[PDB]
Amino acid sequence: KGEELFTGVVPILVELDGDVNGHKFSVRGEGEGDATNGKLTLKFICTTGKLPVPWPTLVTTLVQCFSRYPDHMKRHDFFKSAMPEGYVQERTISFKDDGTYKTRAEVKFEGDTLVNRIELKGIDFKEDGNILGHKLEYNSTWGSPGWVRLALCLTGLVLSLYALHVKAARARDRDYRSCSRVFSSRWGRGFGLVEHVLGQDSILNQSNSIFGCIFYTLQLLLGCLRTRWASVLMLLSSLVSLAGSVYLAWILFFVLYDFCIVCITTYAINVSLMWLSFRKVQENSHNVYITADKQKNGIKANFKIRHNVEDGSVQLADHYQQNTPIGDGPVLLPDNHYLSTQSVLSKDPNEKRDHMVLLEFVTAAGITHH
Secondary structure, eight states: OOGGGGSSEEEEEEEEEEEETTEEEEEEEEEEEETTTTEEEEEEEETTSSOSSOGGGGTTTOOGGGOBOOGGGGGGOHHHHTTTTOEEEEEEEEETTSOEEEEEEEEEEETTEEEEEEEEEEESOOTTSTTTTTOBOSSOSSOOOOHHHHHHHHHHHHHHHHHHHHHHHHHHHHHTOOOTTTTTOGGGBGGGTHHHHTOTTOTTOOBHHHHHHHHHHHHHHHTTOOSHHHHHHHHHHHHHHHHHHHHHHHHIIIIIOOOOHHHHHHHHHHHHHHHHHHHHHHHHOOOEEEEEETTTTEEEEEEEEEEEBTTSOEEEEEEEEEEEESSOOOSSOOOSEEEEEEEEEEOOTTOOSSEEEEEEEEEEESOOOO
8 A cells, every 4th residue: 555655764744833722833843753663753843932832732743654553454554555645634632621622634745754734723721720831741750649649648657657556555554454346456467367378477467557557658659650560560559458458348347346437547548549540550551542434434533641740640631533534545444443652752952942852652453363
């Protein structure tokens, strides 16, 4: 088809004309695309001055024809099949609790250069928000855990240390001849299970409250990292804590019958942390979901993008996408499948103007080999 055009490397020119809440701006980027490896390298600069919106909010609008489709999925590459005539890609980007982007781009060959010409208009953005307020995170490693997580983990830790204290106190008061069955209960060490498995003398047979200190400290720390292993580790830890919490709840109700406010609160915190940890792993996977549009003879796509805010929360971005060819498309439109995209934003220590260096790796999946 048009795959012959994407062997080797292809130059890339991107021009965006944007208007967000009356703020008019233009962006220009140049780079190279290697569809053989699914690799994309581009440098963008704002030719009109300071950019009125954080750079990560434009990564998606600022050329999916360079995606690496495995050999067995070649016939599902509508993008490359649409060349060199090109296609028209429109997108509606709804920012949760904020405004909207509407984009119409023409992607086509102009000689040797792949050209993406974009018109973008955002409406109903609140100028105090994370977008027009520049409250997002450019590429970043250490960050804040958010007031929700900080509160949950600080609370859990305080209740842990408190549990230890109460144990200590009853210990003394006994020697002189609420929530009291729980605070002198052999369940409160090793979950009443370690002593039966590893033996009483083991060092793993610690007070539930100690595993609590380590658990909430770990959750708060991993809350500060942005890597993948931090999200997954957070998920597994939250899982262990959830199992132990459901068990100890089977011990509170159904065994001890002590409706302790401390312990119950613990349960609520562990459920919450489980939910958040669950969300994180979902959000990090930046995959794009692609279906075929017979009425328009093109394709549609739905997906959500997570943008890390500087205060610890996450701005969600819902993405509706359409692509209609300009000349003649694939003899068959692609079956359902998705595009995994890994982005890396960086800066140029020599660039005096508002800019963004973008590296990107896109691969195709969703269709196993027959």
